[PDB]
JSON list of N, CA and C in Angstrom, two decimals:
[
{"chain": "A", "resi": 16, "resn": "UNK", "atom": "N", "xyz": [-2.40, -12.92, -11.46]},
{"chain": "A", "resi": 16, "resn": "UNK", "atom": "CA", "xyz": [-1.46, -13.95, -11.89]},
{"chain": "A", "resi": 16, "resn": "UNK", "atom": "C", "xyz": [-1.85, -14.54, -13.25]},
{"chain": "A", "resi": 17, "resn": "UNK", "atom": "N", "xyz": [-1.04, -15.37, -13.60]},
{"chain": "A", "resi": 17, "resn": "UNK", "atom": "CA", "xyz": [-0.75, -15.80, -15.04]},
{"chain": "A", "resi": 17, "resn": "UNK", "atom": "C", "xyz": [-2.12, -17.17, -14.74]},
{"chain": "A", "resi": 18, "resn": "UNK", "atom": "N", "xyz": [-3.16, -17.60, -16.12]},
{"chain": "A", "resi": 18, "resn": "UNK", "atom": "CA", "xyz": [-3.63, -18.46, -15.69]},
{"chain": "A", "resi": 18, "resn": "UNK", "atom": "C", "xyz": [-3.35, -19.52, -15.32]},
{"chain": "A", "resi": 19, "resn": "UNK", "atom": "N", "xyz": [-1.94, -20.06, -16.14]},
{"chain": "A", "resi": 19, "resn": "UNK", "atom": "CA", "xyz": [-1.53, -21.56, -16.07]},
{"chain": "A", "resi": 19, "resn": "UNK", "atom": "C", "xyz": [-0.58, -21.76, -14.72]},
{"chain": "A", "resi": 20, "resn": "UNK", "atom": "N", "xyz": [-0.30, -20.77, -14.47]},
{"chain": "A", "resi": 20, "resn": "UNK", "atom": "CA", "xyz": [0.56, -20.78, -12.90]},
{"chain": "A", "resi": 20, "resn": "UNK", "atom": "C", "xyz": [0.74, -21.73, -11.97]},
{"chain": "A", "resi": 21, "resn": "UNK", "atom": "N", "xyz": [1.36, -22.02, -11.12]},
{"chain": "A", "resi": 21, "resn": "UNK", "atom": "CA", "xyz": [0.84, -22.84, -9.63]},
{"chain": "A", "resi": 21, "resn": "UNK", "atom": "C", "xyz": [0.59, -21.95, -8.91]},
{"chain": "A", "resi": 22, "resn": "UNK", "atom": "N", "xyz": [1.32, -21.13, -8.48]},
{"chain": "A", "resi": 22, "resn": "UNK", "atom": "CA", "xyz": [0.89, -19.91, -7.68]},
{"chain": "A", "resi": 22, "resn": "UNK", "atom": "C", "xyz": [-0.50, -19.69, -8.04]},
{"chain": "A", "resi": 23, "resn": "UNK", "atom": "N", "xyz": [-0.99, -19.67, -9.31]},
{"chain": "A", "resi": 23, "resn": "UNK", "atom": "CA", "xyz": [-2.42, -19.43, -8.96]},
{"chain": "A", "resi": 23, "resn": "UNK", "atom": "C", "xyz": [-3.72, -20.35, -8.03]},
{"chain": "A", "resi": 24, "resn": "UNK", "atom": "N", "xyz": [-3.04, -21.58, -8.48]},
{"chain": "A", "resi": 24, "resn": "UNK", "atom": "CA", "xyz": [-3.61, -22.62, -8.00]},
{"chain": "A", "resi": 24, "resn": "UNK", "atom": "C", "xyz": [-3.52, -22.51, -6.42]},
{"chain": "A", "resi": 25, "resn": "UNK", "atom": "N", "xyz": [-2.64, -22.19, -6.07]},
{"chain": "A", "resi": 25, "resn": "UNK", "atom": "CA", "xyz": [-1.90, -21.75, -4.69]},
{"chain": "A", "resi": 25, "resn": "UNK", "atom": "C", "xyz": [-2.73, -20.99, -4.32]},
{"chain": "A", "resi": 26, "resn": "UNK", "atom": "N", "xyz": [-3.08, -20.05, -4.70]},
{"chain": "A", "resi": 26, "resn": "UNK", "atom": "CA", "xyz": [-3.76, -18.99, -4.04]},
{"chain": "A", "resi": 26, "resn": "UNK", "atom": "C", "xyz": [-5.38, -19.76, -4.10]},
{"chain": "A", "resi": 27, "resn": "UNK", "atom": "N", "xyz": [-5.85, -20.22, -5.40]},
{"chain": "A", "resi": 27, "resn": "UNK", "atom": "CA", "xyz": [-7.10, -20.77, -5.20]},
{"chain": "A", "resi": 27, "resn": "UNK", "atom": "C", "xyz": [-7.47, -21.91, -4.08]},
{"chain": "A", "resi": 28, "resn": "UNK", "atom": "N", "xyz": [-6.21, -22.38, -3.49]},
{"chain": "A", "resi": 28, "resn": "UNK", "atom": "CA", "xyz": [-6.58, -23.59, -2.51]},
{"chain": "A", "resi": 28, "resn": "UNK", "atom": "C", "xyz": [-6.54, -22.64, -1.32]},
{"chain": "A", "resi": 29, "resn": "UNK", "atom": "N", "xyz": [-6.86, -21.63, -0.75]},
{"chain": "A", "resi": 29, "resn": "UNK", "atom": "CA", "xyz": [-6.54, -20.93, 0.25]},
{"chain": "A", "resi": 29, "resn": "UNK", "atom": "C", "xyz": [-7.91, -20.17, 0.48]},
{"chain": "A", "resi": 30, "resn": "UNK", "atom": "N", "xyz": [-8.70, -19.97, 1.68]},
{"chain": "A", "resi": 30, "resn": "UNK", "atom": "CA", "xyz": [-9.52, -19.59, 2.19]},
{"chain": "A", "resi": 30, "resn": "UNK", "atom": "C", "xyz": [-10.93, -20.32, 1.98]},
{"chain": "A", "resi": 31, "resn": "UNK", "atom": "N", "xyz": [-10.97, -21.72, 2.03]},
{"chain": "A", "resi": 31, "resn": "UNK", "atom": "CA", "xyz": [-11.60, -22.69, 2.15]},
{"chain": "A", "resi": 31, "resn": "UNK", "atom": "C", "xyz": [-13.11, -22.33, 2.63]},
{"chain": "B", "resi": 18, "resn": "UNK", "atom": "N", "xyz": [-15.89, -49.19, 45.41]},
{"chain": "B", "resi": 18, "resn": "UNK", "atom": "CA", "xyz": [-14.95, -50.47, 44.66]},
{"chain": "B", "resi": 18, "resn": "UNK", "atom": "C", "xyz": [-14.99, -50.00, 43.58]},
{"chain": "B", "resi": 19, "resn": "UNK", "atom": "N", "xyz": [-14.93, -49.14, 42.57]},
{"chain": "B", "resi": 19, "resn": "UNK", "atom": "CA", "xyz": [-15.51, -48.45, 41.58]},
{"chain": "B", "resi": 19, "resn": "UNK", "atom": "C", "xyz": [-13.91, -47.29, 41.21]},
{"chain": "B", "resi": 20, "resn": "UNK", "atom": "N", "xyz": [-12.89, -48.08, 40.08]},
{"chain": "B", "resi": 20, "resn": "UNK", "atom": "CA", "xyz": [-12.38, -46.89, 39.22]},
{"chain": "B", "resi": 20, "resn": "UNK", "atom": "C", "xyz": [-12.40, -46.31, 38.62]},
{"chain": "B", "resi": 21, "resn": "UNK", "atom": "N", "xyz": [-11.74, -44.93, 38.64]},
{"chain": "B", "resi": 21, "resn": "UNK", "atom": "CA", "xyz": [-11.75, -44.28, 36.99]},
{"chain": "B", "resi": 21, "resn": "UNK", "atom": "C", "xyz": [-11.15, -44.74, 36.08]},
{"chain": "B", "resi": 22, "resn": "UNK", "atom": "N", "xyz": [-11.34, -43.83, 35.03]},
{"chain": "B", "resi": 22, "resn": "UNK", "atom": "CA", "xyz": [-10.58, -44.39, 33.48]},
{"chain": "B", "resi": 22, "resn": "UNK", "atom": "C", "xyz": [-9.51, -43.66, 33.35]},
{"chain": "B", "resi": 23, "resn": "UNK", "atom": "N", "xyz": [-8.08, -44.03, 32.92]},
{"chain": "B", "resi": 23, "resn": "UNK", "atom": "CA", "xyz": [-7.32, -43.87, 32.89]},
{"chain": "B", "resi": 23, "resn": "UNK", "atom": "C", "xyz": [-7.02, -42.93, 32.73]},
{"chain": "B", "resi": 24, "resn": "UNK", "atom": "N", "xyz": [-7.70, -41.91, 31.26]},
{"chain": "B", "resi": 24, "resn": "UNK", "atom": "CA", "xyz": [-8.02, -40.79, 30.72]},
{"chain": "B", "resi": 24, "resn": "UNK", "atom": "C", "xyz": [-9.35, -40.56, 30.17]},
{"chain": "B", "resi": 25, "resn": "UNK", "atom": "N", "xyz": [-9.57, -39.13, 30.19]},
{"chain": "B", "resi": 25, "resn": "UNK", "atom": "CA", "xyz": [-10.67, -38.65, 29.60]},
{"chain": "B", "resi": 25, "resn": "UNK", "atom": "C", "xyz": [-10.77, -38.72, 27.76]},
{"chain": "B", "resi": 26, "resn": "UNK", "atom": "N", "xyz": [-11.67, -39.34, 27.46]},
{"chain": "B", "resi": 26, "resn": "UNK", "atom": "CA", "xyz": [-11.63, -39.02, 25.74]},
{"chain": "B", "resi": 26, "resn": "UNK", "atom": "C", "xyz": [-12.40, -37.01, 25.83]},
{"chain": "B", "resi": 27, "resn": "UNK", "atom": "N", "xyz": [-11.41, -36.50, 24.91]},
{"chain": "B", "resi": 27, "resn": "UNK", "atom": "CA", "xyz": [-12.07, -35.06, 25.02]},
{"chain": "B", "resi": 27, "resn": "UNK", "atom": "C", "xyz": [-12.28, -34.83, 23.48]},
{"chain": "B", "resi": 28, "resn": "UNK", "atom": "N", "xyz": [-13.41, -34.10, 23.31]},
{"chain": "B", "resi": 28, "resn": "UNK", "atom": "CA", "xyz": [-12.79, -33.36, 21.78]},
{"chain": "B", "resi": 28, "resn": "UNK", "atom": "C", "xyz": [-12.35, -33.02, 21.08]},
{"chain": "B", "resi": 29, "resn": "UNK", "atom": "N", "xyz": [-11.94, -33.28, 20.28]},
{"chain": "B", "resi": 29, "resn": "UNK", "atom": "CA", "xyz": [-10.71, -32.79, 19.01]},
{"chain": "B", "resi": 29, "resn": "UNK", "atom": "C", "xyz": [-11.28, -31.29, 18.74]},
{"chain": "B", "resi": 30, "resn": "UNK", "atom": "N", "xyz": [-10.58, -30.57, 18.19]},
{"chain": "B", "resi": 30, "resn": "UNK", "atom": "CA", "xyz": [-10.91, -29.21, 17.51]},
{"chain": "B", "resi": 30, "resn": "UNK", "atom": "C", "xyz": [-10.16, -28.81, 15.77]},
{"chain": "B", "resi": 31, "resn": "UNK", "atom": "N", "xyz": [-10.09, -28.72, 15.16]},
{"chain": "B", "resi": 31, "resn": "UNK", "atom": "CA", "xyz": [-9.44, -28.72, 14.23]},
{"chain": "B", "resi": 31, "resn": "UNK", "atom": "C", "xyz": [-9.49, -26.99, 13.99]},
{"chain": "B", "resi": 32, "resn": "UNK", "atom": "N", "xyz": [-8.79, -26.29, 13.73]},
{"chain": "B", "resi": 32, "resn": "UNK", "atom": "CA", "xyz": [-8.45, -24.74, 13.68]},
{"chain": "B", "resi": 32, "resn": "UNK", "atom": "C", "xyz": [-8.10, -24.32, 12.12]},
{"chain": "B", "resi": 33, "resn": "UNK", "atom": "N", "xyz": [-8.50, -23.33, 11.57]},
{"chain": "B", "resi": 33, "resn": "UNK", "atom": "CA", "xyz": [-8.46, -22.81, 10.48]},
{"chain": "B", "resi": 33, "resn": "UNK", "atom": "C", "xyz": [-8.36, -21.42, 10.20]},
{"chain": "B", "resi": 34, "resn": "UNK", "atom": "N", "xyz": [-6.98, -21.00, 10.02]},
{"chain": "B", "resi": 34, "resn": "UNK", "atom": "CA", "xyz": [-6.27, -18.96, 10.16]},
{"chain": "B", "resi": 34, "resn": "UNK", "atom": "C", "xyz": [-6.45, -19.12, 8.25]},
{"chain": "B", "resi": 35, "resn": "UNK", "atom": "N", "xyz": [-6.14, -17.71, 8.41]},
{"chain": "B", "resi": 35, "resn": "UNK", "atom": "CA", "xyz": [-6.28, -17.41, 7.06]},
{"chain": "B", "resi": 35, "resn": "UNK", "atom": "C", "xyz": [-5.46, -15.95, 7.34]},
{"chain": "B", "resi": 36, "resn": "UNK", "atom": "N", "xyz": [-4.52, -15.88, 6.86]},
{"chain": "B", "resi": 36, "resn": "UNK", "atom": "CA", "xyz": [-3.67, -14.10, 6.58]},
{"chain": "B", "resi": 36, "resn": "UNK", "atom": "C", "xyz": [-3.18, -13.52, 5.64]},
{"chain": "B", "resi": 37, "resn": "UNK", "atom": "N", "xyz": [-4.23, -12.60, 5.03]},
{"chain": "B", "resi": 37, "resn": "UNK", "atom": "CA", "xyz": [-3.62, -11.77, 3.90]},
{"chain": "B", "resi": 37, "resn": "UNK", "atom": "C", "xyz": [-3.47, -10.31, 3.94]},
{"chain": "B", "resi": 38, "resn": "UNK", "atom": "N", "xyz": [-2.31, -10.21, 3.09]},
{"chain": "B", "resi": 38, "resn": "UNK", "atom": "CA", "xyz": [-1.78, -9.08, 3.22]},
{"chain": "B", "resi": 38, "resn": "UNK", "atom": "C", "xyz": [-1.39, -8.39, 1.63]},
{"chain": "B", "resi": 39, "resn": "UNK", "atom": "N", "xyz": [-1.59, -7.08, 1.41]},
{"chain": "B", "resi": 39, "resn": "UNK", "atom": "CA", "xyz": [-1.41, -6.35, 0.02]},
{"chain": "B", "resi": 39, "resn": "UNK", "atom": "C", "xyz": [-0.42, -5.13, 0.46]},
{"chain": "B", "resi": 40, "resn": "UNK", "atom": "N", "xyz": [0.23, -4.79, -0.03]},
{"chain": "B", "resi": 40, "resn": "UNK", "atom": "CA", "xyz": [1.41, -3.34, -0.15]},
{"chain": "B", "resi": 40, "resn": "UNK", "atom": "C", "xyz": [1.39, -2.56, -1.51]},
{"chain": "B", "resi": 41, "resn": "UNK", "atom": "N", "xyz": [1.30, -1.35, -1.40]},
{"chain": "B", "resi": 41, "resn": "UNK", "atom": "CA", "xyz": [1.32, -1.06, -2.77]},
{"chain": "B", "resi": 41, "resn": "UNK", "atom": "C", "xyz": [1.87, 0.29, -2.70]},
{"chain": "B", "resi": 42, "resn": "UNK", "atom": "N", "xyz": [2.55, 0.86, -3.27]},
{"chain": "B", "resi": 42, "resn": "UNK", "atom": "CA", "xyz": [3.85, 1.85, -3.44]},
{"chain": "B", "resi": 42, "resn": "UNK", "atom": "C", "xyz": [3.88, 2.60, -4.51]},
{"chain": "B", "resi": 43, "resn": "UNK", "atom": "N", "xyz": [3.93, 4.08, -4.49]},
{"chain": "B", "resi": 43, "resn": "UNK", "atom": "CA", "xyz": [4.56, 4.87, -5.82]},
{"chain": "B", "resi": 43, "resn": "UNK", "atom": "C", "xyz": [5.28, 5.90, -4.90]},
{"chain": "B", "resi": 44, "resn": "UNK", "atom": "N", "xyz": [6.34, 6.39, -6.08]},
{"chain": "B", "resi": 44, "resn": "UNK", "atom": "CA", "xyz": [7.61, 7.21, -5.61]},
{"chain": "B", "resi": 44, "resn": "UNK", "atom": "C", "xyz": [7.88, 7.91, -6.80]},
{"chain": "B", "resi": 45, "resn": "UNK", "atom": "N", "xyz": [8.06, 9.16, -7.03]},
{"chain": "B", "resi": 45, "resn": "UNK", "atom": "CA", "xyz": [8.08, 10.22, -7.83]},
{"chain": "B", "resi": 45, "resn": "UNK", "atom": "C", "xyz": [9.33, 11.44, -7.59]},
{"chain": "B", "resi": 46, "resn": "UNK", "atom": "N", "xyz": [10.18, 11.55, -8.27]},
{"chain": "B", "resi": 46, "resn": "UNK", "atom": "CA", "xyz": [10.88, 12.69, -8.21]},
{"chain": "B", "resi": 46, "resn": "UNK", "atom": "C", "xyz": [11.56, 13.29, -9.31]},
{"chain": "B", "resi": 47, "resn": "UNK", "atom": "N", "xyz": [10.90, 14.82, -9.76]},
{"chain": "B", "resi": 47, "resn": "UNK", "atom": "CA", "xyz": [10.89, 15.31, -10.92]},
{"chain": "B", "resi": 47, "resn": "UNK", "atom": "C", "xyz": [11.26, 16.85, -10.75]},
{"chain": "B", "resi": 48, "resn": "UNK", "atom": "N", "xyz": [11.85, 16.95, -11.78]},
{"chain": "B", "resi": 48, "resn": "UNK", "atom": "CA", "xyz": [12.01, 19.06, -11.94]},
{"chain": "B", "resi": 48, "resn": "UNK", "atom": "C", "xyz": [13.58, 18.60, -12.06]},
{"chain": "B", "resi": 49, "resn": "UNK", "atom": "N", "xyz": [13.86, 20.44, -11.81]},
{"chain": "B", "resi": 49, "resn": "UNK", "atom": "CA", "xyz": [15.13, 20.75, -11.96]},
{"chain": "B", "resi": 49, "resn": "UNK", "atom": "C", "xyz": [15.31, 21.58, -10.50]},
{"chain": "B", "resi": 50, "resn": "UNK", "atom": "N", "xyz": [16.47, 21.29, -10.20]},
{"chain": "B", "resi": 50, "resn": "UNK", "atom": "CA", "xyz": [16.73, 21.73, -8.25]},
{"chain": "B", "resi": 50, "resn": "UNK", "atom": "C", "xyz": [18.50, 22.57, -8.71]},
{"chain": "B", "resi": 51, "resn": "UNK", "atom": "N", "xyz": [17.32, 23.77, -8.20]},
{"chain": "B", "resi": 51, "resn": "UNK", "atom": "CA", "xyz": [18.88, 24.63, -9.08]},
{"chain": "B", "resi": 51, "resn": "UNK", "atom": "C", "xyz": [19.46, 25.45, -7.27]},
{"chain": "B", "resi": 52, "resn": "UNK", "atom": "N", "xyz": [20.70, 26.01, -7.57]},
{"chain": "B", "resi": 52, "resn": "UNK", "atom": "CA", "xyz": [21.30, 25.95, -6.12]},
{"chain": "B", "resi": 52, "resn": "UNK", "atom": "C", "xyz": [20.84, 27.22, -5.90]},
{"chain": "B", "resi": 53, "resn": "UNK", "atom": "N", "xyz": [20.68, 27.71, -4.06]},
{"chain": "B", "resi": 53, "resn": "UNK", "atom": "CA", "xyz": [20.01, 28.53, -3.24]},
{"chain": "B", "resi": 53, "resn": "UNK", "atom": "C", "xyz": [20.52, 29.76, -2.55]},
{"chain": "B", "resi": 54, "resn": "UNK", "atom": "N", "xyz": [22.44, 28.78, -2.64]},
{"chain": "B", "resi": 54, "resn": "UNK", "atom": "CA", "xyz": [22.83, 30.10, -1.68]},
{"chain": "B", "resi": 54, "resn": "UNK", "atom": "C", "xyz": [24.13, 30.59, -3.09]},
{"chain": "B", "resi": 55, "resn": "UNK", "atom": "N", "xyz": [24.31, 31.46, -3.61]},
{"chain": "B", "resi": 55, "resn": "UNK", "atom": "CA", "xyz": [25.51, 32.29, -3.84]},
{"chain": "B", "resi": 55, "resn": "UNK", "atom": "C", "xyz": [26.17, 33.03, -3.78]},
{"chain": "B", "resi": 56, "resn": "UNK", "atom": "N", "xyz": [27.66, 33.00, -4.02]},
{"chain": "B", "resi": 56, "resn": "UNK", "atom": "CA", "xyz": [28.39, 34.52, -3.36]},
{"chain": "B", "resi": 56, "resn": "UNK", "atom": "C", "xyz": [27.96, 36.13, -3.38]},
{"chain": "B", "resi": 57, "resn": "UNK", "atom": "N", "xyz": [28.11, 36.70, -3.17]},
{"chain": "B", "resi": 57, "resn": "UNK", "atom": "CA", "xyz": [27.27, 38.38, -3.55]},
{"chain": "B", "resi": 57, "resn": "UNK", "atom": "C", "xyz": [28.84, 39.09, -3.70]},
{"chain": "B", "resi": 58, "resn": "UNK", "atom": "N", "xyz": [28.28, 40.11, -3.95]},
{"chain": "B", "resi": 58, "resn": "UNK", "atom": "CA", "xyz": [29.21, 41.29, -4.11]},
{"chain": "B", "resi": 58, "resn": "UNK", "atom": "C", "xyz": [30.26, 41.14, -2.65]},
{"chain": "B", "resi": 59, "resn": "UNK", "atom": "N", "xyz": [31.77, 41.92, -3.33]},
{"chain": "B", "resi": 59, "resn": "UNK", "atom": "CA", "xyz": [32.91, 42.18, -2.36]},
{"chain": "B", "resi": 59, "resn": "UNK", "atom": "C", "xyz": [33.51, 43.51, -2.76]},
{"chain": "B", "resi": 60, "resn": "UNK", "atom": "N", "xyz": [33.81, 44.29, -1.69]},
{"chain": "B", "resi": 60, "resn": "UNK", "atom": "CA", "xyz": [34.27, 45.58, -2.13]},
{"chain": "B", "resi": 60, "resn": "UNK", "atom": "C", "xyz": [35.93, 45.49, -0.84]},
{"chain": "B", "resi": 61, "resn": "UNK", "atom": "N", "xyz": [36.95, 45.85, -1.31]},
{"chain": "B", "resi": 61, "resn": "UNK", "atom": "CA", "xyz": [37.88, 46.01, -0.58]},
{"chain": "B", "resi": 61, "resn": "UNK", "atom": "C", "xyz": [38.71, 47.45, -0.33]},
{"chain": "B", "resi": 62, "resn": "UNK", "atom": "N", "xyz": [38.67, 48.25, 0.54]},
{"chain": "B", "resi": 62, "resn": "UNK", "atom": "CA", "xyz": [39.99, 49.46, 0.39]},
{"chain": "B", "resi": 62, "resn": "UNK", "atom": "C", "xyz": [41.54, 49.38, 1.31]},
{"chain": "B", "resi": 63, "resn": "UNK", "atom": "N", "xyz": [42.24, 50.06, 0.92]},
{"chain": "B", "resi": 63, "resn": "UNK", "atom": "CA", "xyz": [43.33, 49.82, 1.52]},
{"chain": "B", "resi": 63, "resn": "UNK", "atom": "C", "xyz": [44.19, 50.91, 1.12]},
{"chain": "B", "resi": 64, "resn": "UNK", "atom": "N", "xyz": [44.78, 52.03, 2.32]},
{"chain": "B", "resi": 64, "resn": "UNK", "atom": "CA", "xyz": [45.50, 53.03, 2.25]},
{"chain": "B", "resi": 64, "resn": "UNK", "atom": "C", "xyz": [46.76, 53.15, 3.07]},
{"chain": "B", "resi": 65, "resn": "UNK", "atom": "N", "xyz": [47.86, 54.03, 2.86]},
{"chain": "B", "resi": 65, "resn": "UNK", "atom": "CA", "xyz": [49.25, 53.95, 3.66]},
{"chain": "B", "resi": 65, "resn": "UNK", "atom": "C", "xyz": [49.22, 55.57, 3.93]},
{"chain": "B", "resi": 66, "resn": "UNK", "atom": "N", "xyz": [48.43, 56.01, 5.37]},
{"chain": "B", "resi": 66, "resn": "UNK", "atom": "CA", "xyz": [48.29, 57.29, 4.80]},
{"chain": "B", "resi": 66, "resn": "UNK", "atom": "C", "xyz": [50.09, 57.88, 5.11]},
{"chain": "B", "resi": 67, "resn": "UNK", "atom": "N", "xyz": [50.52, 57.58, 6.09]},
{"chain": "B", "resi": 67, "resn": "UNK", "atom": "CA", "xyz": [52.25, 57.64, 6.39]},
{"chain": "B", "resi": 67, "resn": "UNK", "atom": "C", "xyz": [52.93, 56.25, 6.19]}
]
Protein backbone atom coordinates (compact mmCIF):
# COMPACT_ATOMS: atom_id res chain seq x y z
CA UNK A 1 0.00 0.00 0.00
CA UNK A 2 0.57 3.63 -0.56
CA UNK A 3 2.46 5.18 2.57
CA UNK A 4 0.10 8.00 3.39
CA UNK A 5 -3.02 5.71 3.16
CA UNK A 6 -5.56 4.82 5.95
CA UNK A 7 -5.80 1.50 4.79
CA UNK A 8 -2.34 1.31 5.69
CA UNK A 9 -2.81 2.46 9.01
CA UNK A 10 -5.68 -0.07 8.99
CA UNK A 11 -3.75 -2.80 8.40
CA UNK A 12 -0.97 -1.58 10.94
CA UNK A 13 -3.60 -1.51 13.86
CA UNK A 14 -4.34 -5.23 13.27
CA UNK A 15 -2.60 -8.19 14.87
CA UNK A 16 -1.80 -6.60 18.15
CA UNK B 1 -29.48 -19.29 58.93
CA UNK B 2 -26.83 -18.56 56.41
CA UNK B 3 -27.64 -17.19 52.51
CA UNK B 4 -26.23 -17.17 49.33
CA UNK B 5 -25.35 -14.33 47.13
CA UNK B 6 -27.49 -13.48 44.70
CA UNK B 7 -24.91 -14.14 41.94
CA UNK B 8 -21.58 -15.38 41.40
CA UNK B 9 -18.89 -12.61 40.41
CA UNK B 10 -17.02 -14.82 37.56
CA UNK B 11 -14.25 -13.81 35.28
CA UNK B 12 -14.30 -11.73 32.46
CA UNK B 13 -12.32 -13.07 29.39
CA UNK B 14 -11.62 -10.71 26.73
CA UNK B 15 -11.00 -12.72 23.17
CA UNK B 16 -8.74 -11.72 20.35
CA UNK B 17 -9.23 -13.52 16.33
CA UNK B 18 -7.14 -12.34 13.82
CA UNK B 19 -8.04 -13.57 9.86
CA UNK B 20 -6.00 -13.20 6.98
CA UNK B 21 -6.35 -14.06 3.78
CA UNK B 22 -4.18 -13.50 0.21
CA UNK B 23 -5.48 -14.70 -3.52
CA UNK B 24 -3.38 -14.37 -6.26
CA UNK B 25 -4.22 -15.22 -9.99
CA UNK B 26 -2.67 -15.36 -13.57
CA UNK B 27 -4.56 -16.33 -16.79
CA UNK B 28 -2.91 -16.63 -20.17
CA UNK B 29 -4.24 -17.34 -23.60
CA UNK B 30 -2.07 -17.13 -26.68
CA UNK B 31 -1.36 -18.63 -30.36
CA UNK B 32 -3.36 -19.00 -33.27
CA UNK B 33 -6.33 -21.91 -33.12
CA UNK B 34 -6.78 -22.73 -36.70
CA UNK B 35 -9.91 -25.14 -37.58
CA UNK B 36 -9.67 -29.20 -37.33
CA UNK B 37 -12.30 -30.68 -39.26
CA UNK B 38 -12.68 -29.96 -43.26
CA UNK B 39 -14.60 -31.10 -46.17
CA UNK B 40 -12.51 -33.79 -48.32
CA UNK B 41 -12.94 -34.85 -51.67
CA UNK B 42 -16.57 -35.82 -53.52
CA UNK B 43 -16.81 -37.91 -56.53
CA UNK B 44 -20.40 -38.45 -58.11
CA UNK B 45 -21.62 -40.93 -61.21
CA UNK B 46 -24.78 -41.18 -62.78
CA UNK B 47 -25.98 -43.32 -65.87
CA UNK B 48 -29.47 -44.05 -67.93
CA UNK B 49 -28.36 -47.30 -69.19
CA UNK B 50 -32.27 -47.73 -70.88
Amino acid sequence: LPKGSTTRDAVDRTLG
Amino acid sequence: LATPSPFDMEKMVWLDVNILEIRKSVLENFGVDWSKQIPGPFAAFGKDFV
